[PDB]
Design a protein around this ligand. Structure first.
Ligand code: NVE
Ligand code: CL
Ligand code: CL
Ligand code: MG
Lengths: 552, 405
């Protein structure tokens, strides 16, 4: 009940001294419950009486437990915590089910009285001092300090987890084949031994634990499959997410939709094809939690399709490190992507989706590559290697785009799979000026104070046209000017702008955008048969540029 | 040896940098290497009372199949800059860029034979992660001078000097410069004579610590912004030319355009051909003259950071500029000759190496690539013992064009 393990040395933050909070006066029954509780703790070693010489104090309270007639002590460590050194993080990620090696057996052991079962650095105990006040604060209160890790102190999760790691260590050494996952105060222990030998190896591990201060349930009390953990339901040779129910409601509030999206997002790691775009749109311009939001027809369509997907129970498989890792991605439309990861078709380890918009304007080839980077990182985390990708895009489409684009890239080994919609490029700008095509010199302007703006073009065929724009920006007009030139031009066009900003957007060959303007230009660029887009410096007295320059 | 005390910049706490995900084979490698370093007392395991962390990686030694530990101390170095630069800085010789041949040697094994100030060791904490987070990270700190920390050479400085004295006295016309884990050794000897002198230097080093490539810096020349000479010229060609000279004019004093603009007069079609004038033909030659030269008025400011921009040109060619003040280029260049990330990675190390030789300083890179792609892949091709600072940018497509050819 108090581990013999050596303590972790602990310090207050370098400029600070221990807490000195005054104990509020408590009730007679509160005072009584505490003396009861503390006497029992004191006998077990958990705490000790100290003199009045100790300057430190932090407040204690008592509240009636679980509506029952039990009392729980409750120490308020906010002040000590603010003064205690920072610790290293327990875990920097949580394991995913899809990454677990299959095991013949796993049993769960929980540690009883976890924090109280571990010692606290001798030199730090004086800082955990509390005082049970006497009745009406007449007389000196009873002062104890902790000898073990307190509940609610800042250091206990971390010193506990490391103490256990130190304790598990030698047993790991002698049992390299045995798997032990430490989670909070649970141990998950798994082997490829047969029941008996496993039953044996367990009670032998329990025994190593007890030599070290750690009590664990015996066979009679060890829980059974499926194991419920971190929102997952983990059966012996398949896993899934814990049971998911999508409410039926006549109407949805902000808060209803948030919980819907949270569940769908969580279901999406094993139910393929989940979508939340149309539901997330409703959440925009976020209003009151209690507020009713009527569903769009698109959000209603989406909920309905998610509803079918979740209709019949799906499950995931565990990881066999000898087999290979394959990953497939499908376009689902409007920046939405979905993926499956399996080793043997089509039994998924896990699924996922990717929606992110990196930038204001993109094309499918950029999004696909981004999704691949995401899935690659995730694979490294979960399995420690990158998968073999199967992608909905031709080797030539991809080759064409990325050799020509200005940014570098490199996706791991992939191969094309014909799973429409396929990702393609919808237009390509030209390399060279077009002979026999009308050259538009376009330009734009916005008055910074009035915010009013003109846009228009001049032609080598003498043509000309300029329009007015209310409350715009210098950027907005320069795209307007390009759009004008596309509308009024034939199937082949040269265009000359002095907007690096418009050039950059168009050069990168976007097929989708947040700007309606840019989508209009895109519709145009696709309908065209040839467009060559060029840039000239402003106000340098360059040809047609100056003409349209003053016009606007 | 005697422990020299170390201090962080007042206020600044240590590095708390997160550990990037590693593949299985790199984790396995790190465990072997660290189990062996622990046995030899170079590192010790640490408890959760140590809140600090710096990233750690595995790379393949330059020309060699064998895993090597690379610790990313960029944060610590930044937080230590008072120590390794002002109290105990290594002076950088201006003569190094001058030599015909410079050889780089790894002398990192030197540092492990020296204790690190005990009040500092906690800041050198690092974490070996596990796959799928199934076991808590394995955690260590250093007991000796770590490789990659700029403090190590600053501290080992007087030991290095004692080691190099005989070789220096016997070979006065050789420059030796220490930077981080490397020794840069330049001479004007003929190449065989140069190599022979390196081996002798390895033997001196060998009697203390070392195991049982050549730059040719004075052959480094800038990549001039190049103005084509063409058969005929179109309107498009002229404008592209104007835009380009227009850009040079913001860097090189004396660049003139006026005569070329005159050629554009009117509002004419893009493909049309246009007659080449003497004023233009001359002005053109006058500019082309200036681009061959050092920028008049640009000078290295030791107090200021170096910056390196890199543009993907295509066909395996890359261009780059180094400046402290934007547009004021201390050096331009190109790198050439698979895989977009493998190449960028090679260009960054090459550009860093030259920076060390010329300035004694490393550049902050502006890299044309998605952060996550770079993070994932760079270590797969990295071979240096240092790591430059970087950030990620989308290359202005105009900048790319002006540095073609
Ligand atoms: C008395 C005999 O055992 P049993 O009661 C049921 O045994 C099981 C239960 C689940 C699995 C799934 C794979 C499986 C493999 N490893 C797991 C787990 C499941 C697991 O449940 N959790 C929570 C886990 C979480 C995070 C990291 N690691 C794990 N571990 C560590 C062993 C395999 C065996 O009867 C079986 C003969
Ligand atoms: Cl609720
Ligand atoms: Cl060279
Ligand atoms: Mg729990």
């Amino acid at each position: 009940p108090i581990s013999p393990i050596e303590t972790v040395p602990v310090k207050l933050k370098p400029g600070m001294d221990g807490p000195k909070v005054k104990q509020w006066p408590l009730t007679e029954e509160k005072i009584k419950a505490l003396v009861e509780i503390c006497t029992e703790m004191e006998k077990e070693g958990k705490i000790s009486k100290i003199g009045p010489e100790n300057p430190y104090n932090t407040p204690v309270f008592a509240i009636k437990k679980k509506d029952s007639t039990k009392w729980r002590k409750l120490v308020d460590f906010r002040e000590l915590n603010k003064r205690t050194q920072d610790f290293w993080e327990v875990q920097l990620g949580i394991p995913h089910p899809a990454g677990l090696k299959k095991k013949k057996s796993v049993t769960v052991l929980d540690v009883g009285d976890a924090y109280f079962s571990v010692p606290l650095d001798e030199d730090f105990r004086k800082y955990t001092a509390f005082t049970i006040p006497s009745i009406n604060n007449e007389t000196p209160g009873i002062r104890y300090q902790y000898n073990v890790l307190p509940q609610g102190w800042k250091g206990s999760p971390a010193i506990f987890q490391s103490s256990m790691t130190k304790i598990l260590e030698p047993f790991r050494k002698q049992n390299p084949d045995i798997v032990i996952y430490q989670y909070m105060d649970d141990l998950y222990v798994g082997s490829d031994l047969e029941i008996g030998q496993h039953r044996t190896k367990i009670e032998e591990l329990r025994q190593h634990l007890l030599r070290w201060g750690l009590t664990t349930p015996d066979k009679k009390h060890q829980k059974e499959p499926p194991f419920l953990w971190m929102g997952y339901e983990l059966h012996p040779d398949k896993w899934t997410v814990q049971p998911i129910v999508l409410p039926e409601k006549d109407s949805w509030t902000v808060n209803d939709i948030q919980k819907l999206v949270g569940k769908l997002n969580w279901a999406s790691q094993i139910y393929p094809g989940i979508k939340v775009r149309q539901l997330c749109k409703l959440l925009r311009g976020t209003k009151a939690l209690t507020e009713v939001i009527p569903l769009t027809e698109e959000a209603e369509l989406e909920l309905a399709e998610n509803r079918e997907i979740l209709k019949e129970p799906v499950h995931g498989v565990y990881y066999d490190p000898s087999k290979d890792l394959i990953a497939e991605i499908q376009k689902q439309g409007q920046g939405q992507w979905t993926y499956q990861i399996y080793q043997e078709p089509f039994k998924n380890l896990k699924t996922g989706k990717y929606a992110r918009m990196r930038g204001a304007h993109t094309n499918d080839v950029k999004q696909l590559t981004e999704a691949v980077q995401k899935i690659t990182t995730e694979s490294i985390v979960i399995w420690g290697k990158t998968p073999k990708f199967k992608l909905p895009i031709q080797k030539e489409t991809w080759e064409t785009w990325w050799t020509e684009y200005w940014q570098a890239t490199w996706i791991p080994e992939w191969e094309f799979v014909n799973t429409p919609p396929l990702v393609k490029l919808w237009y390509q700008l030209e390399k060279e000026p077009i002979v026999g095509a009308e050259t538009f010199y376009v330009d734009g302007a916005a008055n910074r104070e009035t915010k009013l703006g003109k846009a228009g073009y001049v032609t080598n065929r003498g043509r000309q046209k300029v329009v007015t724009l209310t409350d715009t920006t210098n950027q907005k007009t320069e795209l307007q000017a390009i759009y004008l030139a596309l509308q009024d031009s034939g199937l082949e066009v040269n265009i000359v702008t002095d907007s690096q900003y418009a050039l950059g957007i168009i050069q990168a060959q976007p097929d989708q955008s947040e700007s309606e303007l840019v989508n209009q230009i895109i519709e145009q660029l696709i309908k065209k048969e040839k467009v060559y887009l060029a840039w000239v410096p402003a106000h340098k007295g360059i040809g047609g540029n100056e003409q349209v320059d003053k016009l606007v | 040896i005697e422990t020299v005390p170390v201090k962080l910049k007042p206020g600044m706490d240590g590095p708390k940098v997160k550990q990037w995900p590693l593949t299985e084979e790199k984790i396995k490698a790190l465990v072997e290497i660290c189990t062996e370093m622990e046995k030899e007392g170079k590192i010790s395991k640490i408890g959760p009372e140590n809140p600090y962390n710096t990233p750690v990686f595995a790379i393949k030694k330059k020309d060699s199949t064998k895993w090597r530990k690379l610790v990313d101390f960029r944060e610590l170095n930044k937080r230590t800059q008072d120590f390794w630069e002002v109290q105990l800085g290594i002076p950088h010789p201006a003569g190094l860029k001058k030599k015909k041949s410079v050889t780089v040697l790894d002398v990192g094994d030197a540092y492990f034979s020296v204790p690190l100030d005990e009040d500092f060791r906690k800041y050198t904490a690092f974490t070996i992660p596990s796959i799928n987070n199934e076991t808590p990270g394995i955690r260590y700190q250093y007991n000796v001078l770590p490789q990659g920390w700029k403090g190590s050479p600053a501290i080992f400085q007087s030991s290095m000097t004692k080691i190099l004295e005989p070789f220096r006295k016997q070979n006065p016309d050789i420059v030796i410069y220490q930077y981080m884990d490397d020794l840069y050794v330049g001479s004007d000897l003929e190449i065989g004579q140069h190599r022979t002198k390196i081996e002798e230097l390895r033997q001196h080093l060998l009697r203390w610590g070392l195991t049982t490539y050549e730059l040719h810096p004075d052959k480094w020349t800038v990549q001039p912004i190049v103005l084509p000479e063409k058969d005929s010229w179109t309107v498009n060609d002229i404008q592209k030319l104007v835009g380009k000279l227009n850009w040079a004019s913001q860097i090189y004093p004396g660049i003139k355009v006026r005569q070329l603009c005159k050629l554009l007069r009117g509002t004419k079609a893009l493909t049309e051909v246009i007659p080449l004038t003497e004023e233009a033909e001359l002005e053109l030659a006058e500019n082309r003259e200036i681009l061959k030269e050092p920028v008049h008025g640009v000078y290295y400011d030791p107090s200021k950071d170096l910056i390196a921009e890199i543009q993907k040109q295509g066909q395996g060619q890359w261009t780059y500029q180094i400046y402290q003040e934007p547009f004021k280029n201390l050096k331009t260049g190109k790198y050439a000759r698979t895989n977009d990330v493998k190449q960028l990675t090679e260009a960054v190390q090459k550009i860093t190496t030259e920076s060390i030789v010329i300035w004694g300083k490393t550049p902050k890179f502006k890299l044309p690539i998605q952060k996550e792609t770079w993070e994932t892949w760079w270590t797969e091709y990295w071979q240096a013992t240092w790591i430059p600072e970087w950030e990620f940018v989308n290359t202005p497509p105009l900048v790319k064009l002006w540095y073609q050819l």
